[PDB]
Amino acid sequence: HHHLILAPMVRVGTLPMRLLALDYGADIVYCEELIDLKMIQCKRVVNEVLSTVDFVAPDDRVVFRTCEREQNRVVFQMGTSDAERALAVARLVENDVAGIDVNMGCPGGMGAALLSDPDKIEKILSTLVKGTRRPVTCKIRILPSLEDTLSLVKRIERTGIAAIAVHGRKREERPQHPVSCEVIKAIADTLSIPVIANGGSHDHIQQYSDIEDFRQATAASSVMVARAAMWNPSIFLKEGLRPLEEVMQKYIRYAVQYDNHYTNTKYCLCQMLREQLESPQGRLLHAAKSSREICEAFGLGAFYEETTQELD
Ligand SMILES: Cc1cc2nc3c(=O)[nH]c(=O)nc-3n(C[C@H](O)[C@H](O)[C@H](O)COP(=O)(O)O)c2cc1C
């Protein structure tokens, strides 16, 4: 049995999508990238009302929210360009998450910008590996040189990281451009640690059975799914895809139970609906100025009132 992983995604990877991905059969769920500069301003707050652990910023904004359900399966992804600041964040969240990931693939010089400075990647990763009891991973995009990609990947493993997620595309290579299954394979063979294949959503993964095909084509230990999970989170379901109306109902119920900010809920729903945003329901969703108005657009107004009342 191989591992089905929810890839990190800014705005999409909040608590409601993570819980929904686990319900549909994901083994590991990554959260959206969170910048170290915001996280170092946060306090850990135990929320007895929602039964969540909250990481609250000085402006009273909840930056990260987790719960007992994802406790052993959530991977905290951070945006960092400083080893001490990275460890400060890991020490804040380590008791509430299952792993620590560092973005090395993004477009303040943190993501794919790090790929050019292997000395900085080496400093950041070793500091985290030595400083936390949690498995450290990272997520990279490939380099323009196959020699430099392979050189960097062996350098990354040497820091003592648990696994490496490989997005089989170079920085500047648009999603239009196909994924490099060959470059992921060359990496998976040369490494002793597990390699997580990533990058084949529209072109390779349209159904559950295609995930195994992509793991074979790349010779990786597991596959990480982003866009296909964003479009329909039931991509993890072995039995087949579920109707979107059904998935969206389950999405909103989680967003209300866990007091997700309505603009975030709205965003994730627009990503699922995409062409259906011109339907009367899509028009109503676009117009929604609150969580109550989102539930109204989806016949969940009764559910919202009963949850809001039971929460207050
Ligand atoms: C909306 C969106 C947000 C993303 N945010 C992040 C992020 O927070 N961290 C990250 O490492 N990659 C981010 N990615 C990239 C994905 O994790 C992934 O590497 C990429 O989409 C290729 O995988 P896929 O073909 O399965 O979509 C994002 C992708 C999308 C579509």
User: Nearest C-alpha to atom 30 of ligand 1 is from which residue?
Assistant: 9
Strand partners, 6: 29, 225
Q: Is residue 89 part of a domain?
A: yes
Query: What is d(CA 203, CA 7) in angstroms, rounded to the nearest whole number?
Result: 17
Q: Which atom of ligand 1 is nearest to the CA of 169?
A: 22
Name the DSSP letter for residue 276.
Answer: G
Q: Which two tokens stand for residue 64?
A: 């990260």
Query: What is d(CA 86, CA 89) in angstroms, rounded to the nearest whole number?
Result: 5
Counting other chains too, the contacts that 263-269 makes at CB distance below 8 Å and 24 or more residues apart are 264/11, 264/14, 265/16, 265/291, 265/294, 266/294, 267/11, 267/12, 268/11, 268/12, 268/14, 268/16, 268/17, 268/230, 269/294
Cβ(69)–Cβ(61) below 8 Å:
no
Number of domains, the chain: 1
Cβ(264)–Cβ(282) below 8 Å:
no
Question: Rounded to an integer, what is the distance from CA 171 to the centroid of its chain?
Answer: 19
From 114, 139, 167, 204, the mutation candidate for ligand 1 (largest count of ligand atoms within 8 A of CB) is 167
Q: Which domain holds residue 160?
A: 3-231
Element at 240 (helix H, strand E): none
- Experimental resolution (Å): 2.2
| Binding pocket residue ranges, ligand 1, CB within 6 Å | 7-10, 12, 32-33, 77, 103, 105, 139, 167, 198-201, 225-228, 230
Q: Is residue 146 part of a domain?
A: yes
Query: What is d(CA 295, CA 309) in angstroms, rounded to the nearest whole number?
Result: 15
Q: Is residue 308 part of a domain?
A: no
Q: Is residue 283 part of a domain?
A: no
Q: Using what technique was this structure determined?
A: X-ray
Q: Which two tokens stand for residue 210?
A: 């295609």
Q: Residue 167 sits in a domain of what CATH number?
A: 3.20.20.70
Q: Is residue 290 part of a domain?
A: no
Q: Is residue 285 part of a domain?
A: no
Number of H helices, E strands in the chain: 13, 12
Residue 142 zone, left/alpha/beta (φ > 0; ψ -120 to 50; rest) = beta
Strand partners, 66: 53
From 184, 227, 235, the mutation candidate for ligand 1 (largest count of ligand atoms within 8 A of CB) is 227
Residue pointed to by tokens 């969940």: 300
Q: Is residue 297 part of a domain?
A: no
Q: Is residue 186 part of a domain?
A: yes
DSSP of 150-166 = HHHHHHHHTTT-SEEEE
Confirm whether residue 10 is marked as ligand binding.
Answer: yes
Query: What is d(CA 151, CA 241) in angstroms, rounded to the nearest whole number?
Result: 40
DSSP of 24-65 = TT-SEEEPPPEEHHHHTT-EEEEETTTTEEEEE-TTS-EEEE
